[PDB]
Amino acid sequence: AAELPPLVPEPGDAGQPFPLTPTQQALWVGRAYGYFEWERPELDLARYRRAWERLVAHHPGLRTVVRPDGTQHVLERPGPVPITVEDLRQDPDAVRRLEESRLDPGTWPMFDLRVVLLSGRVRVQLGIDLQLMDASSLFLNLFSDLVTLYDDPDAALASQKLAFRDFARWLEEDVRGGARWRADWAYWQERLDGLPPAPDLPAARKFERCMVRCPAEEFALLRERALAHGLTETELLVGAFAEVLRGWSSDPAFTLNVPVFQRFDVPGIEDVIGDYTNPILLEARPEGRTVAERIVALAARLRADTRHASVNGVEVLRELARRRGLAAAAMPVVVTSLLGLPSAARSITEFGTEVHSITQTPQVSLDFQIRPEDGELRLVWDHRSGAFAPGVVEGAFEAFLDLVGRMLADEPGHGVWEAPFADMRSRRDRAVWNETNDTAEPVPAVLLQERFFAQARRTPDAEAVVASGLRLTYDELARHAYRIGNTLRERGVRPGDLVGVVMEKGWEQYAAVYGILAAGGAYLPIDAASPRGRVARLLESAGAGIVLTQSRLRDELDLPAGTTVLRADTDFETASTAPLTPVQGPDDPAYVIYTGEPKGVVVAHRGVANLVRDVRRRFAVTPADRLLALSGLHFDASVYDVFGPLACGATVVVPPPFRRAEPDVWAELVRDERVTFWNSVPVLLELLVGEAESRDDRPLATLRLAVVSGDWIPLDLPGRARAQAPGLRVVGSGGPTETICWSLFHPIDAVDPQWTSIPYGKPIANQRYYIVDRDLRPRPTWARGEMAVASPLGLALGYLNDPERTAAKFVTLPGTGERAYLTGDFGRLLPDGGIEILGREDFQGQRIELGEIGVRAAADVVRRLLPELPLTANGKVDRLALA
Template identity: 30%
Template sequence: PTLPFGLAQVQHDGSDVSESHRMLPPALNDRLRAHAKRLGVSLASLCHLAWAQVLARASGQQRVVFGTVLFGRMQAGEGADRAMGLFINTLPLRLELDGSVQACVRSTQARLAALLEHEHASLALAQRCSGVPAGTPLFSALLNYRHNAMGSNERSGLPGVELLSAQERTNYPLTLSVEDFGQSLGLTAQSVPSLEPERVCAYMQQALHSLADALEATPEIPVQQLQVLPEAERQLLLNTWNAAQQAYPSHVCVHQLFEAQVERTPEAPALVFEDQTFSYAQLNAQANRLAHQLIELGVKPDTLVAICVQRSPAMVVGLLAILKAGGAYVPLDPAYPSERLVHILADAAPAIVLADAAGRAALGDAALAECTVLDPVTVPALPDTNPSVVELTARHLAYVIYTSGSTGTPKGVMVEHAQVVRLFEATQPWYGFNEHDTWCLFHSFAFDFSVWELWGALRYGGKLVIVPHSIARSADAFYQLICEQGVTVLNQTPSAFKALMASQAHRALSDQLRYVILGGEALEPTSLQAWYATHDERHPQLINMYGITEATVHVTYRPLRQQDSEQAGSPVGTRIPDLTIYLLDAHGQPVPLGAVGELSIGGAGVARGYLNRPALTAERFVPDPFSDDAGARLYKTGDLARYLPDGNLEFVGRNDDQVKIRGFRIEPGEIEACLTAHPQVRDAVVLATGEGSAKRLVAYVQAEADAHLASTLRAQVAASLPEYMVPSAFVRLDAWPLTPNGKLDRRALPAPDDAALAHQAYEAPQGELETTLATIWAELLGVERVGRHDSFFALGGHSLLAVQLMERLRRRGLSVSVRLLFEAPTLSALAQTLGQRRDVVVPANAITPDTSAITPSMLPLIELTQADIDKIVEQVPGGVANIQDIYALSPLQDGLLFHHLLASDGDPYLLLVQLAFDSRERLDQ
């Protein structure tokens, strides 16, 4: 269905619809009539084509369907023109806007003529023939082209009858009536409150104007090139909301800002890791010694230097040293699979690699054979003065960070110093970061969120706390670190913050916390309701920032309010001042206000491009057609958004298959390529299912039947790709389900069953603890059964589900940390660990089958006198022999009982529904 502006509800009564009317300029009316006469088509055909153009721009579709009102008397037989009654009918009209202007005019005329033959067909029949499910509307927009003998201002009625008022109502959310008065044309638009009807009239008038111009001068141009936006709205979207702001420094390098801070506060703490603390002067000196060594080895501007180091002070020293030497760092996280790291190393081809012991082990000797390898843990005895690289400018590269690639290989995004520096300068008026702030380096330094964390702290003289890998995986431990270190600026993906919220639900976060900056994936505002129930909306201030690596981390800024948590959309706010944002359709034209379009980003934050990928760079980094600046470019993000009436943006999703899970950008194509590399797999498709923290990857493969296929493929992917890219389930199919057009029907792919999970050979859980764990795992992971050798992560578990598991175990008196689950991921191993750590002993029930009398000492969960107990026993059929235990109702049960007793008519907890079927056949179906 075509749903312009996302309007889909066609069942309302029309009471909230507003209306606007305008007459078209006489000159435009005359031109349209002349073109219709010249081409031998009806004026109605031109109006239907123009309306189709409006709906196409408002829905993002090239093939549009909308309702058209038919007179009903053309095919009604002799005398129909004199018969009384309502003959009009509404039927769907489908138009394909893929040809030239003149060709689309003729095809529209033909479609309307063909539809007249069915003017008495019911809309229900059209719905059944369309293949569209019964609950889905065929269309949500309507065009009513009607002839009216009266002039636009003639409202004379019958003699003696006075017209007091008239109102036209429609159950459709968007309706346009074209009034043909013979010598003039009028437009009447009706729309729901979210869309002003005056705007609808303006779109239609502009579409008709563009159509008339094209028919006169360029009838062979593609119809999609016609303008629909009135000039005033076009200026608003392209210029007013993208007005140039002040310029920010473009001549300073990232490390030079750090060096300036060293001069201001040399003894202030710059870096904290576990029990180590480095002052700004100490950190600078360490980095300088290593930088001088890199310069001696030939590092110069735009030289790539890879760094593969665990989270530690040496990591920060290495990054600073690379920048100070004039080079650009390529971060390689040792926690990532070696195959991925080796591929990135080969693609970037750095001559020098900084690697500690973990980094060397992850990369392997073969990959490092052609490189000069330095260990940043041990810095050389060289001068600790700031090196001077005369030829270095802010237009040289600062880093290359690799993101997931659709072709099966990751791609390196090249970002310059100037683009990083302006990010902080442009956002500083909003935040006011200072030397009293404490930041966390929570994310992997191979994830671009770390750019914001790392250089944000050191740029403004704050303290940077490096979060150890084990603590980053445990929400409880991370919460403790936040409080101990007095963190004031916290950066989180929404998924990670959700886990943190759960861990501190009954505890207060540090009073010093000023900002929680959310980014990296789409935010579900409703997930923040629990937060706002216990926290002030400004202390700390939650901020949502949409961003993308190719536009230097962050793009927009939105301070969140409690009312946002009650909305369904994902608000991302307004652009960073030195960027431009356009929402464009598939043809590069701005979409109407409120319609969904692809986010295209321009301005000072746009990256240089992709390393060694000129064709992909040219495809995604395109010339900016709306800018007067020489060389201005746009980055086509592939993300979809809409403008809200106040100029703020709302994130909608992706226009391709790329997904974000737990903050990580993932190209399913990369996983598919890994799967198809296995000899058993003929073809593969990877989809993301679920929403929010429940989102997971499911792999569908064409392969021969194999009982161990899921386990085999999981091992294949895990050996090559990071943990967050490993599918939770592997579904084997003999062939793909196809659409009538022969394309893969993704909606017909089956949901994964228990066989799709990487089970081990089944062995039933043993003992009470394993049985309890198996039950919890099955509920949490949505699987039928869990064997004692199954792995929590192989069955689809991940770090966020691990937090939920810990909470459920605590309720049962079992103390365990997330780290232990990673160390003992199988059911039997975890049970053994828990058995050694169990610190709650459940007393045996004092009431046994042989008990003849119950006394207060047998009931530890409730305080009752002997008289109370005897009274209860008397009311239970069978007496003591039929009583297993006695305990108080929970508050919820108490409430249920109260409402049950209170209700005099019926029971509020029983819902009675009566259904009627018109035939036995329908009932059997």
């Protein structure tokens, strides 16, 4: 170690100023205060006055003021003690007037006394500055003596050696810079680059207090638990607190201010009112497998942070601001612990029983206070209401109390102690997620091509496909599907093969899909606009043989000779209109769709069929509904346009092929065919509604359902669309291609203005949406995390054939065992249950949050400005081309 210089007392010349202490320096600039309240039957005010008159002397603090020159001197003739008695005994509505309630160091009384007189009862209130003295002083000296002094104001008091002004000049001059000081600034200079920012907890873009009183018996068990791991009553208590926090914490590592109220064991200093406040920056990095392990390890780093106490935290934090940014250093999370200081003479409880007590420490968002009191350990969480999203503190406190409770119930080395983690979600956190994720419904085994075949037999007259003017009935499509599918099986389209379907938008694709499924295979959609090289590339990498195509642009297909190619509009006509029989199963693949290297997606039958018959049972999909099949069949979004409508008698309406979005034709074709179902990415319905508003007719007037998904549903768009056809119910969805087109549905009924984004929603039937930390564990509400869509049948079979990708992105959760897809999107659960979608590794997102109230950063805007934003291949918003 290193011994320190001795304190030089000065019996006199105390009237002359001494500089402000570091903990105090930081409060006298933020001005550019605590409060208590006890009750008791009768307060003898004269006695009380004289007590407080003697309490204003003795301690050189209760008189000190701050000269506006930035220094503090003592006073010696202050005035009389300003006690402000209020009277409300014969006042009815006395609780009401008492209710409305709540300072400068330039002006003597560094506080604010009061005494409100209610009927039969007296309510003593004490303001106080927090620049004036510190927590330990307040409880160990002021209150203690004040009890002594209310009892007998003339009672003997203690001889005040070496007044505080001395300690002040002492640490400032004699102690700073010396042996122990120089030794200790190294530690923090050799860790200042290892310090993790403060707890990053959720916000929601005055002071409230949860507290709990532990009885004496429960105290002592608590302490006993602490020693049995070699910890102190405050050692374990910080450790637990770190755990709770990690739950909602948006990273496991953070830094906890743990101030220490040291006086360097000076003789007589435990009787001086002063600011002995030394912050310590405890680094919380989860070190260990178990609680017992991780709490014991953080306890270690605390003590080591403590043997180096001479360098005040204020400096360390300063130098921290120097190395990094200023704001990127704030320590809003603190743990004030008056355990382990001496047992004072008197306990404020003797005087009167509390009623109110809120520390107003500023720049502190959450203040875990640990103080003992007449036998009990008082735990208290004082938190700045509005620093965090709703409930976040109510929930962590519930979870905290459980954690400590189990520790009161588990013999060390057993139970929670040797538990690898602890689920912080509160009873509601759970109730809401269970209740919103209870999606358990059996899917009837029916081949996706069988369902359609059976509706075609059910309503063969009906309009199945309307494409490029040439319409098609359900029987004529079915008959041409039989034609194709028979032809395929004949050429050996064995069960489980992939028949690549490469064409443009038209009625050829539809029959192509249902003949290929019929033939016992799965269809592999490839865009006819891709480069003449990438097409054959995807086909070769998927190992696909036969390829169906339209005859137009059939020669513009550079494919090999081992891969057969047939036209659909002609190279089929001379076939069997006799139905083929289902050879393939419900768990066999129906389509592979492709998406740093592109990955193919394998999708079953069972899941798509789950989709189809939910969407029908969600929005009452009736055969009257006529749908604008806008998405390209190579985009995952097209799948409801294939199998959705035809599986209960609706009509599919194919628009003329495009490359650039053409909301003109779309408004036309929607206006003309009485289209009632719109399905695309949000920008496409935006462009449509923009073209439609600027028209005299009502073109989009028959629309009864609009499902946007895959991008960001623009905040205004639901109203702007709801503008035309009064009665359209807009709905937004999404979920990755590996999750069967739509997974989570949010009916867009009332865009909230203070929303950064449209809620992602509640899950559909059979899919469960989880929000997990880095450990694939469920998070509690609001918490950021990655999204895990859990599902036996509504999950993608696998990533093409590469098993690495598939077993790495499709995991088993350890909480349950559910096979889940790690979406690679990050979000947070919402206390109605829905999900808020936040981006994908977008944490460095505000942007639109502070934008619409125009794109994101990288910044770009459109109305480095630019005319209008660029799209991607199927629409959305090309955030990758923008830098």
